[PDB]
Every structure is written in C-alpha cells, then in structure tokens.
C-alpha cells in the first residue's frame, strides 16, 4: 500500500508520515514543486530525510537578521567591525584560532573589563597550549568551550578546579564520555579528587565507575552511595546500591536491593542471592477477542499514542476499557503501564502462535528483544525508521526478505506483520547467537551491530576475569544506548524464561560472560 504525496499532506505530522515521505524521496518521486512547502509537513527534520530534501531544495539559511553584517567580516577585517559584531564572531573558537596573534592581543585588551571570558580565550590561543592557559585561570566556561572545540587537550587538573567543573551543565556528558571511551587519561585521573558532596545522580555514578578503574574502592563506594541517595529512578538507585554491596559487602544494602519495586538485573540478582521469591508478573488475559481498531495502520498508532501520552487519569480509564481485547493487547499493556504510574510488571506474549514451535530459550530472547524494541506495537517506527515489533531497518529487512528468503512481492512494510517480524527476528537472532552465545552479547549486537560488539569483545579489558567482572564491563560498554539496552533485555530474558517454565539462574548468565 503506497501513499502519494497528496494523501500524506492531509495526514497529521508524525514519524509515520516522515517515513512515507522518505520512501517517496528515496524513489525520486518528490519533484522540486512538491518539495516547496514540505518542511512544514515533516515531524522530525533531522538525519536522512533532511539531507534527501536538501538535494532537491538546498537551504542556505539561517543567520539571524540582527547580526547579518557581522558575518561579512573575516579574520583579515575583524578590527573594522563594531564591538557587537566583534563579540558575536568571537563565540567561535575556530574563528579565534584563525586570527593572527597581533589581533588577538588587541581584542584581548578591548574586552578585559566587560568580557574577560573572551580575553582569556584570545590570550590562550596566543600560546602553544590553550587548555593549559585556561586551566591556570580556572575559567570553567572556557574549559568546556575548549573541550568541545577539541578533545585532544589533556592535562592534570588540581582539586580546586575539578570540584568547580560539576556546577557546569556540560560536566555530566564530559565525564561519561571520557570514562566510557577511555580517553583523556589525565582528566580521568584528576576526577578522583572530586568531592562526592559536589556531584549527584549520573555524574556521581560514573565518578564511581572511574574510581573502580583506578582501584580506588573507598572513593568508589562514596560516589556510588551519593548516586543511590540522589538518583530519581528506582532502577538507577538499584544499580548504585549493587555497587555499594559489591565493594563493601554490607548485607543491609543487599536486603534493600532484594526488596526493590523495580525489576532489573540487580534486584533480580539480589533476590536470588537472598532466596527471595521471583517478583509478581501481572496476568493480562482479555475475554474480548477484537474491536474496531486497525493494528496494521501506522497512522492510527501515531494518533492513539499521542492521546495516551497526553491524557488525564479519567481518560486513561476510558482508553483502558476500549482497548481491553486480545487483538489490541499491546495497546492495553501500553495504557496500563501509564495508568498504574509504572509500578506493576507487564510481560505480555502476543501473537504467540508464531513462536510456540521454537524452543523456550529462543522464545524468551525473541520476546525480550520485542518488549524493549517496540513494547509489541506492530506498526512501531523509530526515528531512524526501524519498523514493527522487532524494529528492522529497511536495509536489513530487504536483504532478508528479497535476497535470502525470496518472498514473493516482498515490501519492507511486511515488517509491520507480527508473523514476519517474529520470523525475521528469529532468523537474525539465530545469526547473532551462533557467533556470540550470551544473550547479553546478542542484545548488544542486535542494537548496535555485531561490528562494534566484536570490537568490544576483542579488547583485553572487556569481559575478562577480575574482581568486579562482569559487572564492571557492563558499565564500560562504549555507547550509552547499548549499555542500557543490554541490561534491560537481559532482565526481560530472565523474566520470560521464568514465565515459560524454563527458568535459569541469573548467576549462571553472569558466569558465562567471563571469557576463558
């Protein structure tokens, strides 16, 4: 089922509409005339749809009309520009780097009183190490502009300076990136002297991980304790309390972790170590078979999803009743997760007939991936236009569909069919498992590609033997999305194996992650 550009313009803006516009663009079906008023019909003007539309209508914009004259100057003529223009152009460190040193000295004096931040950057670029100059002034704003300009700068930072960095909004991403990428070792070592009083939440957590890489277990405990006290989400608290336990072995930490309302790998592990029963998994079994909603219509999902997200307690009860059917089970569960304020545990098994002939271990992995990828919504579409319950990108879907399986009249929109999604998911999971074995490693590869997973596993500091392994390595996966994805899919997999009466102990999974 195609949609022409006319039909699409009559639909509301969404990721579904973006997807169908992108399909027209890749097939060269959008003329220069169709493309004129098209920016206002795109929900997320980023990535592939933007670069494709810009081959048709290339946009020169956007400079602010107030500062238009300021962008006519260059490095050779900046001293002819008025003071407002000079200051605007000095926002760019590349521009500052391009200036000659006589003109940097001149501008530095011009700006000493009213903007000493500019003065420090100007004079810093007259040296062979701008980072060293900015560090000596303890100019915190300048430090972050330099780091964003270039990641190669690396230098030891003293106690006074590192303790000022956390007050800047850049700090969290700065600390995480250098820690998980294992870059800027002098910055990393310096961050051992940040007082836990001065950090919180994610920044405290990563400063704890950093302390562990230098075997500073006492500093690590203090950071993780601060993370546990300050974290918003119960899931992140648990992650931090686990580390508190692993380092200092206090049984009250483990007990607290075993009694957590969040179902995650850390609370599940704590329950297993204390002989606490497996948590209660809700049971959704609607008597009503079907209703008038079309689960194969991606536009209807975008519409109903926005209703659900932007609704009061009263409207969620009406929606709950309407979608309490077998045909709409994934929507029901979606509504109930928001109706109960994320307190209860929903692990549905929809369109089960398509997977009941696989072994129960494979069933659980399929279900665990699907739960995380789409919450079982058949027409789910990601921002990169991954499609259906198992979130296949068009390239992979066409390779499997057209070349490998030779399906007649295959179109990528077949990924919206549960039968096809599960089938292809099984096929692709088969390929990943034969090479990787652990369901955790499969999950990393399913999300980030087998390329990066093999690169990570080929390193001699990842998933090898050690005091805190494999738990330390799970915190050092070099992409945030993949670190998180793996933890969640692993918990899902444990739960689904339990519901299917093929339980496995999570301690066995953790033992199999250590490469021998």
Author numbering: 18 to 533
Sentences reproduced from the published study:
We report here structure-function studies of soluble periplasmic LT of Campylobacter jejuni. The LT Cj0843 was identified from a virulent strain of C. jejuni and localized in the periplasm. The LT enzymes cleave the PG MurNAc-GlcNAc glycosidic bond similar to lysozyme with the noted difference that LTs have an additional (2nd) cyclization step; this step requires a boat conformation of MurNAc leading to a 1,6-anhydromuramyl product as the predominant terminal saccharide moiety. The crystal structure of the soluble LT Cj0843 from C. jejuni revealed an unusual doughnut-shaped structure containing four domains: NU-, U-, L-, and C-domains.
The structures from both crystal forms are very similar with a root-mean-square-deviation (RMSD) for 509 Cα atoms of 0.75 Å. At the N-terminus is a small helical domain (NU-domain) connected via a flexible linker to the helical U-domain. This flexible linker (residues 75–83) is partially resolved in the P3121 crystal form and fully resolved in the I23 crystal form; it spans 22Å between ordered anchor points I74 and Y84 in the NU-domain and U-domain, respectively. The most prominent feature of the electrostatic potential surface of Cj0843 is its predominantly positively charged inner ring surface. The outer ring surface of these ring-shaped proteins shows a more random distribution of positive, negative, and neutral residues. This ensemble of positive charges on the inside of the ring of Cj0843 explains why the majority of sulfate and acetate ions, that co-crystallized at 200mM concentration in both crystal forms, were observed along the inner ring of the doughnut-shaped Cj0843 protein.
